[PDB]
Amino acid sequence: WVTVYYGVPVWKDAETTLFCASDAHNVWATHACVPTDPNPQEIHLENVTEEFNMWKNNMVEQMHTDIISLWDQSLKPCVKLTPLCVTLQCTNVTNNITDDMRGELKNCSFNMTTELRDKKQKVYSLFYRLDVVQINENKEYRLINCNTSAITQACPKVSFEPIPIHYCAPAGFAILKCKDKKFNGTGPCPSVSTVQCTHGIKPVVSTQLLLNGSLAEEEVMIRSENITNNAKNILVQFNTPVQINCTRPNNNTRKSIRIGPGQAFYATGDIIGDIRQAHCNVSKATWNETLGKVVKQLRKHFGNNTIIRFANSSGGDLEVTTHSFNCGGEFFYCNTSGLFNSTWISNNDSITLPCRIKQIINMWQRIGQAMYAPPIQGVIRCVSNITGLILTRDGSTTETFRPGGGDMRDNWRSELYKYKVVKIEPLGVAPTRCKR
Amino acid sequence: WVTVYYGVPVWKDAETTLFCASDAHNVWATHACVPTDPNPQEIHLENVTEEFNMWKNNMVEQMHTDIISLWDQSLKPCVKLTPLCVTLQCTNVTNNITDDMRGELKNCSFNMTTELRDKKQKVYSLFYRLDVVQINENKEYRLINCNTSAITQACPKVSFEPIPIHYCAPAGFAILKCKDKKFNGTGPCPSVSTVQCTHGIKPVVSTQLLLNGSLAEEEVMIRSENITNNAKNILVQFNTPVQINCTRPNNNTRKSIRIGPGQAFYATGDIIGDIRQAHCNVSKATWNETLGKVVKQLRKHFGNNTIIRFANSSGGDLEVTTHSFNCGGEFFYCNTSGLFNSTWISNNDSITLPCRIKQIINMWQRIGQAMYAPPIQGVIRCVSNITGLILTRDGSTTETFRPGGGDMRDNWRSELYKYKVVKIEPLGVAPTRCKR
Amino acid sequence: DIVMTQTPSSVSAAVGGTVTINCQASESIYSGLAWYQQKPGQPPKLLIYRASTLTSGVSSRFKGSGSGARFTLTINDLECADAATYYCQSCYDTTIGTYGSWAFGGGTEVVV
Amino acid sequence: GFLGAAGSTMGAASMTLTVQARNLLSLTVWGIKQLQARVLAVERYLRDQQLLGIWGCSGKLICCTNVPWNSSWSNRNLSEIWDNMTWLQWDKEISNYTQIIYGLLEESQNQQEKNEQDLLAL
Amino acid sequence: GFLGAAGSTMGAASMTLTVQARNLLSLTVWGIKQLQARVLAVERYLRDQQLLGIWGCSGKLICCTNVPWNSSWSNRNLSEIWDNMTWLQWDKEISNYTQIIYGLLEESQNQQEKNEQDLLAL
Amino acid sequence: GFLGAAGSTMGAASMTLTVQARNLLSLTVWGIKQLQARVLAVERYLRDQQLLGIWGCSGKLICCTNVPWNSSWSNRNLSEIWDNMTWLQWDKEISNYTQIIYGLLEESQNQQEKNEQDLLAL
């Protein structure tokens, strides 16, 4: 009566270690990944439904951990800049500088160490206002992190380009994927297929806007753990890109300073041509249409005649109040208020966002490990696809939404929401009419 | 009809990871190897031929990588000498010094750090000319690597003796070996046998001459990737050793200087007795006979009446123009022109080679990691077996050959040329007359 | 360690016509075989080397072939040219990898 | 397709059992992680094979045993189980008897082997 | 000798099959390398055993199957293959049909096991 | 109990053989140590299974062979060995013949498989 069957096609929810694969000096060491399958297979499961939950998906946690650990390993061999924690004697840059950019750059000089222990050298360099603090309340200044953390120079040969990786299941596991074009992140998913590896995902880091991800295939999607709870984020995925063009219109020079045997510091040298403010342009008509689509869908949760208003972010550190990104190797902090300034009532041009630049970066919102971004010579221009927003509710007929930042995890759960990891359990039994 | 057989004696070329074994404070950590088999077996394969290629043998690559990595691990716990990058005030040693050695040693003094951060000490030591550069074009000098690399003192307790290791295949693999006494490195090898482990191979490092390897059993062998191509090396294996006796006839003292808590630097102290030039002696008659044998075999590739001439090396750094070796813990750079000075026409005494000594060593031709060799007290004498040469063609009836250096890989492919790694593939099928 | 077996030990003929001598190696010698003719009173003379090449001290009358471990010698016409004992010699010892280890089988007496 | 039979009924799915069986074996970040994953995959494989060995089903995808169905585990008809239900549904229906059945299978095999020795000793 | 049969003919070599079978299992430099090598050796062993399981040849060095020889794979005679050829030569002669034969063996075993269950259910 | 049969006689102990069989598989300090231990445990398991395969006892806890007892190994009576002695005592009594018996078992199995092929070819 009891018949034992091996190879039974059943599974259970499971948490395991995933490995990366890559389709082939990068900060994320993507060369360390397993080469991908040039033609991966996908199997449709007929008559199979499954329950998914993107808010409890541990694939997000592994991606978060791998990214931070790789980032830290990439700085391990790079030169430390601790000899720079000196008193800087410093004044402003006033040569051909545009107003409202005036006061942003400073010309500082100091006594730096050199190749021999017995010698000192006088050097000078330019710094951005956001990287220094005044101590002598020319005036004495110090680098902003000298009383809290060590500063490590990023290696100039290492790229920050967000080259995508694929996550792949180990033997004994499978990754289930949703195909439902309207899936909102939780509950039954009527159309499921299996893959061994995920689509390539770019480890892009941003705050208020998501700059280079996937677009919704059909309708604009609004996803949240609750919607109702004002303590939760709302992730909005666009079904069309919004093009954004960013620039740093200052032709800079770069020079190296030897600070000890085998070690050098890269300093901003001087500026060729006039000094101008960094900025980003967003097409105006596209932005307007894009919000109109978002509002029509937000209203489904708030009421047919509910008014929706957008407002800018709350006060706080640039890292949480501005739109930040790494592009061309520079770290931009842009003012987004020009994008969130409207009230939506029931029934060519551009928006220019001014930006600030910082060289001393606390990359993962951790304290004690500061990275110094060496300057880049020449002029930087970037073009990217805005694919979505992170919004919060500002919380009786009007709702107000504000952009905001969030955990790094929220920028990855937006791509991994369709995937689930299960383990295969091949043994099972059933009654039959046979006996040995 | 189809019968499946398991344990079928067939194999394919393969690349895997080999592990070391050793027959049992050493720089190569040979104690970390698997103890060897006191009586290893070898199986002759009757009626089996195989194709070998020593120029594409990946066993060479693993040996190269293991040696470099072990070398670096051995210096990990050793004291750094960065406090020595100071201005040295320095003069010549003129006390009882032999002419043509005069100017080689210098008496330098400097302000060194000490146990307490608040104190400095005046110390002096002797340096070889090749380890310093003049900066003030007594005169100011600096150590030669202070503008390019960190200097690490080798631990005085660590031995550089080239204790041999054996490479062994993992389960599922076998190492095939040639027995053909005239095998020239490529093509069919009529007599093959199997081993699990290789013979012991000494990790000896040298340039122009190979100082302690295997000898040819019968005839002198000339091996090359091409012979015809002037861009390729020719490896010549002797069938008899040539004895070479090297010495450093200077009785030196050694003293330690405390440079900080738990740290000390080893300095050359002073010289007891007269100061003399380091040198090596090669028996003259043996060298002459040995070249005559090499020439008779070289002519087989160049023509019956072709004249063969030997000449010394081209200009460049000592690391590539001289014969270098590590013996007794000292690093010698010897002038070999006395050995390559003849023209060979169709149809007791000694050769003395003067030598130079360096303490700051860029061991693997890498830049950024410099090793400092602490001095050795007393007098050093070494005796070794020259087993072969690395020659290149200086490229119409006369051929000229010059000794030269090469990759470290060429000193190991000369021992591993007889071995090949294959993997075993035990399943196969064949037609038979049976059916279940 | 290579053992050569030679057969027949005694071969004869009428005057005129051919006879053959066979030789079997215990292991392939990859054609490293030599044939020698030893008349009473002298050392053996080399006739054939590397299985089938003549030394030119011998005419086309002596021909042979083979490969691997098995070889034969054919004497095309016997005019009472000899009363030699013919020997099969291995010139390569595959167990050593050299040409410095030789082996001979017993010989064959040819009578005519 | 590896899980292609997931939507098939039990009597339809258990014909493609080798499809899943063939896919069970298949110091830096992304370095040490692979070594650890490989070891665990091997352990899982071996535990399942050991159980088939213990129950006397080694080398088979389908094996009959001599253990009776106790009814209370599932009182469904064979024509209902094999034709109108999938393996996922079945696995849920009797998930809590897994340990009962395995214990019964183990004892039966021990008794069988002892009896075979008594006959070979005759 | 582990590869001692390499120069033997197929019909001579396949008598010493256990010689090779017995030798398949046998953070510093030369530290981590051994751990990685051991794991891979285990995986190779298991993949070969799984195939013998799937084809119904588990536990045997020599097993007959019920799959016909298709001739086009090799049209040699049995007296030629078994007596005048070595396994290295044979492996080269039919190397490109390896995947064909394995697929045929797998399907045959699945059909056999299903039929045995139908008989035990009778 | 895992070693509960240690004090039992041989004829009593060899009824609970699955108890021990089921327990054979079960970069920081206490990190790397577990990974190394797991690999070695797997290797030990596989070596024992390979021997049972080679001797023709795969899948069994108890298997009869066709190898005779040579008497000189132990000249005790069956009623003495099975009823008045434990496995620990027995293991000591014949510990030095272990390699003899294993060699005999291996050759016997090779002869048996070759003969079975000759019959299936008939």
Ligand SMILES: *[C@@H]1O[C@H](CO)[C@@H](O[C@@H]2O[C@H](CO)[C@@H](O[C@@H]3O[C@H](CO)[C@@H](O)[C@H](O[C@H]4O[C@H](CO)[C@@H](O)[C@H](O)[C@@H]4O)[C@@H]3O)[C@H](O)[C@H]2NC(C)=O)[C@H](O)[C@H]1NC(C)=O
């Ligand atoms: C969103 O996606 C877009 C599109 O993929 C991406 O824009 C790309 O950014 C990279 C880096 O800023 C650009 O690549 C550079 O192009 C210039 C053109 O002359 C080259 O000179 C650069 O090479 C130098 O810098 C390299 C830095 O590692 C060095 O390695 C190299 O040796 C040179 O020094 C470099 O190729 C790329 O062209 C754009 N793509 C387009 C279409 O413009 C954008 O950055 C993404 N957004 C975000 C926020 O990540």
Ligand SMILES: *[C@@H]1O[C@H](CO)[C@@H](O[C@@H]2O[C@H](CO)[C@@H](O[C@@H]3O[C@H](CO)[C@@H](O)[C@H](O[C@H]4O[C@H](CO)[C@@H](O)[C@H](O)[C@@H]4O)[C@@H]3O)[C@H](O)[C@H]2NC(C)=O)[C@H](O)[C@H]1NC(C)=O
């Ligand atoms: C080619 O091979 C030859 C022969 O093997 C080899 O010569 C050997 O070199 C070593 C090292 O130079 C010699 O060993 C030394 O012998 C002296 C004799 O009194 C000892 O005092 C030495 O011991 C001191 O130094 C050790 C260094 O680690 C310390 O550990 C120890 O505590 C002592 O301080 C040491 O034993 C050896 O004697 C010679 N062999 C002969 C026969 O002379 C040669 O170097 C090789 N060539 C190359 C280039 O490698």
Ligand SMILES: *[C@@H]1O[C@H](CO)[C@@H](O[C@@H]2O[C@H](CO)[C@@H](O)[C@H](O)[C@H]2NC(C)=O)[C@H](O)[C@H]1NC(C)=O
């Ligand atoms: C390191 O120095 C900075 C700069 O003085 C300190 O940050 C300031 O802390 C005061 C505390 O009330 C704030 O009002 C200032 O606005 C802060 N300055 C900036 C630039 O944010 C910082 O707290 C010091 N760190 C420690 C550990 O004392």
Ligand SMILES: *[C@@H]1O[C@H](CO)[C@@H](O[C@@H]2O[C@H](CO)[C@@H](O)[C@H](O)[C@H]2NC(C)=O)[C@H](O)[C@H]1NC(C)=O
């Ligand atoms: C971001 O940009 C907006 C406008 O470009 C800045 O808004 C101004 O803020 C001052 C603060 O009191 C107001 O008085 C002005 O009326 C605001 N202008 C507008 C058009 O609203 C805003 O301050 C910028 N944010 C930051 C952090 O600099």
Ligand SMILES: *[C@@H]1O[C@H](CO)[C@@H](O[C@@H]2O[C@H](CO)[C@@H](O)[C@H](O)[C@H]2NC(C)=O)[C@H](O)[C@H]1NC(C)=O
């Ligand atoms: C470090 O200092 C050395 C010594 O001055 C530099 O090497 C010299 O470079 C010049 C360049 O033309 C050569 O002509 C000299 O012959 C070199 N000297 C020696 C001793 O080789 C070296 O280049 C400096 N390193 C760096 C990175 O600048």
Ligand SMILES: *[C@@H]1O[C@H](CO)[C@@H](O[C@@H]2O[C@H](CO)[C@@H](O)[C@H](O)[C@H]2NC(C)=O)[C@H](O)[C@H]1NC(C)=O
């Ligand atoms: C190696 O030794 C040889 C001779 O022992 C040196 O050769 C001398 O070089 C100078 C350079 O112009 C010549 O004028 C002499 O005539 C050479 N002597 C002989 C006998 O040829 C050679 O320079 C030494 N090499 C080095 C790098 O010092």
Ligand SMILES: *[C@@H]1O[C@H](CO)[C@@H](O[C@@H]2O[C@H](CO)[C@@H](O)[C@H](O)[C@H]2NC(C)=O)[C@H](O)[C@H]1NC(C)=O
């Ligand atoms: C999904 O379910 C449908 C029916 O619910 C299955 O359809 C059967 O397909 C077979 C194929 O030959 C037909 O013979 C049956 O008659 C179909 N069912 C009905 C009710 O007509 C379909 O095969 C299922 N998918 C899978 C993977 O089994």
Ligand SMILES: *[C@@H]1O[C@H](CO)[C@@H](O[C@@H]2O[C@H](CO)[C@@H](O)[C@H](O)[C@H]2NC(C)=O)[C@H](O)[C@H]1NC(C)=O
């Ligand atoms: C290598 O080849 C030779 C022949 O080519 C094999 O010799 C055979 O050895 C067996 C041993 O009993 C004899 O019965 C055969 O008659 C021999 N062959 C001939 C043509 O006489 C030798 O055994 C082969 N080596 C291996 C390992 O098989």
Ligand SMILES: *[C@@H]1O[C@H](CO)[C@@H](O[C@@H]2O[C@H](CO)[C@@H](O)[C@H](O)[C@H]2NC(C)=O)[C@H](O)[C@H]1NC(C)=O
């Ligand atoms: C330990 O030894 C004692 C006797 O020396 C064993 O006792 C036997 O227990 C069985 C249980 O049914 C009885 O039938 C036997 O008659 C007992 N022996 C005697 C001499 O009466 C006891 O079982 C042993 N323990 C173990 C684990 O076997």
Ligand SMILES: *[C@@H]1O[C@H](CO)[C@@H](O)[C@H](O)[C@H]1NC(C)=O
């Ligand atoms: C530098 O910036 C400070 C900021 O308030 C300003 O007061 C000062 O006048 C500036 N100096 C120059 C030279 O512009």
Ligand SMILES: *[C@@H]1O[C@H](CO)[C@@H](O)[C@H](O)[C@H]1NC(C)=O
């Ligand atoms: C900084 O001061 C130095 C002093 O001479 C000057 O040469 C340099 O141009 C200044 N840099 C800027 C950007 O004002």
Ligand SMILES: *[C@@H]1O[C@H](CO)[C@@H](O)[C@H](O)[C@H]1NC(C)=O
């Ligand atoms: C360097 O040190 C000297 C010492 O008196 C000081 O006067 C000078 O201002 C320092 N220079 C800088 C740029 O800090």
Ligand SMILES: *[C@@H]1O[C@H](CO)[C@@H](O)[C@H](O)[C@H]1NC(C)=O
């Ligand atoms: C997602 O859709 C499901 C469909 O029933 C719904 O229950 C769930 O509440 C939706 N998610 C949110 C955040 O509303």
Ligand SMILES: *[C@@H]1O[C@H](CO)[C@@H](O)[C@H](O)[C@H]1NC(C)=O
């Ligand atoms: C958040 O979701 C839970 C789900 O049950 C719900 O009970 C809770 O009320 C939600 N939060 C708010 C503020 O509604």
Ligand SMILES: *[C@@H]1O[C@H](CO)[C@@H](O)[C@H](O)[C@H]1NC(C)=O
């Ligand atoms: C943004 O628009 C302004 C409008 O005049 C233009 O001058 C500027 O160059 C644009 N910026 C970019 C990045 O194109």
Ligand SMILES: *[C@@H]1O[C@H](CO)[C@@H](O)[C@H](O)[C@H]1NC(C)=O
């Ligand atoms: C970005 O640059 C492209 C260049 O062709 C331009 O067409 C596009 O309109 C620009 N986007 C914005 C927002 O100005």
